[PDB]
From Swiss-Prot:
Pfam families: Exo_endo_phos (PF03372). This is DNA uridine endonuclease. The keyword DNA repair applies. GO terms for biological process: base-excision repair. The active site is at residue 150. Mg(2+) 1 binds at residues 11, 37. The keyword DNA repair applies. Its EC number is 4.2.99.18, 3.1.11.2. PANTHER family: AP ENDONUCLEASE, DNA-(APURINIC OR APYRIMIDINIC SITE) ENDONUCLEASE. Mg(2+) 2 binds at residues 150, 152, 247. Belongs to the DNA repair enzymes AP/exoA family. Keywords: DNA damage, DNA repair, DNA-binding, Hydrolase, Lyase, Magnesium, Metal-binding.
Length: 256
């Protein structure tokens, strides 16, 4: 039995709903759909967006209205979900949803954008630190883990169109790239790069005219698994053709 998981930063759930979300969801038919940037309390959602036939949905909004938020649609519900690392400043921004599926924990994370200020870059880097502590604790306790979402950092030069121009911009700073190195070194695998070693493979493009059309993008969205679990991963790909956000979805197929 194969399990298909999709991750997608939708840049506002109500917005992507106007741009073909439900039609796409019905075509792709994943077992689990992880979303970032819902920008809505579930009460603000139309019924047909809240309840999609065949799926249980779980929403983790931020405390701040119209900001951040993650969600998960799943055919089979998890035994429970955890919505934080146990650190207040990281747990109130609707960034963390960790679903316990028994065979694995699924971390659906919307990692912070560090571009707007030094304080928010510090927040991003400390969030990275808290995340690594959390996943390591779970992995060390014997859990297999799948981590998906918007990491807001491109790992290597291959992972964005303009590496030189962005080496002093959050998203491609040496310190952020070093954190991704450290994460992987701790025993996790960037699943896309198990299967695809090509350039030009991005998950995000500015809305600035022509950016997406010129493939001036960044790979910001990833599926990671712990090393012990990588043998179960069959596919990891980018759904580059799917419109409606400044990010496109990414996919993982596993067989347990
Ligand atoms: Mg956005």
């Amino acid at each position: 039995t194969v399990l298909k998981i999709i991750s997608w930063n939708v840049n506002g759930l109500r917005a992507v709903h106007r741009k073909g979300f439900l039609k796409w969801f019905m075509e792709e038919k994943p077992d689990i759909l992880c979303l970032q940037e819902i920008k809505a309390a579930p009460e603000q959602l139309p019924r047909k967006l809240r309840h999609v036939e065949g799926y249980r949905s779980f929403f983790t909004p931020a405390e701040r209205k119209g900001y951040s938020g993650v969600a998960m649609y799943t055919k089979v519900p998890p035994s429970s979900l955890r919505e934080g690392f146990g650190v207040e400043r990281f747990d109130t921004e609707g960034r963390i949803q960790i679903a316990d599926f028994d065979d694995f924990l699924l971390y659906n994370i919307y990692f912070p954008n560090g571009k707007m200020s030094e304080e928010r870059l510090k927040y991003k880097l400390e969030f990275y630190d808290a995340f690594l502590e959390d996943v390591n604790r779970e992995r060390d306790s014997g859990r297999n883990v799948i981590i998906c979402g918007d990491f807001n950092t491109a790992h290597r030069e291959i992972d964005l169109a303009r590496p030189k121009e962005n080496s002093n911009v959050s998203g491609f700073l040496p310190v952020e790239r070093a954190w991704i190195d450290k994460f992987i070194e701790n025993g996790y695998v960037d699943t896309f790069r198990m299967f695809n070693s090509d350039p030009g493979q991005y998950t995000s493009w500015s809305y600035r005219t022509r950016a997406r059309e010129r493939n001036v993008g960044w790979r910001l969205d990833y599926f990671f698994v712990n090393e012990e679990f990588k043998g179960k991963v069959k596919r990891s790909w980018i759904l580059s053709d799917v419109m409606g956000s400044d990010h496109c979805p990414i996919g993982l197929e596993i067989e347990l």
